[PDB]
């Protein structure tokens, strides 16, 4: 089962979470790949059977520059990914006021528009409560793999 792992990151934190996710899901036997700065061409070639998106939110409450263009491309083209399983990890900070993971929510909305089935609730990782987001994502990732396998 091919799992496309997408990331949105300003300073690399969500990207490191995504890379961690790739190793864990691959360890579980999934054909998981992290595709940073992926294009529609790359996803088409990959032919994903599942999606994991790991994204922060910018200070302006938008998806980061390395996920926003792809987001718009997917929304505009709407590939026939209806029914495929998906999950979202949202990196926020309640200190800043991003208590909800804005970028993450926008991805959830895109899943709805595509017909991608959210298999787990979004993981909300908050900098005001953790400094080890990779490690903290592990229990959710364990359940996520179970949802795919599964």
Swiss-Prot record:
InterPro entries: Flavdoxin-like, Flavodoxin/NO_synth, Flavoprotein-like_sf. Probable electron transporter. GO terms for molecular function: FMN binding; oxidoreductase activity, acting on NAD(P)H, quinone or similar compound as acceptor. Gene3D superfamilies: 3.40.50.360. This is Uncharacterized protein PA3435. Residues 3-145 form the Flavodoxin-like domain. Belongs to the flavodoxin family. MioC subfamily. Transmembrane segments: none annotated. PANTHER family: NADPH OXIDOREDUCTASE A, NITRIC OXIDE SYNTHASE-RELATED. Its cofactor is FMN. Keywords: Electron transport, Flavoprotein, FMN, Transport.
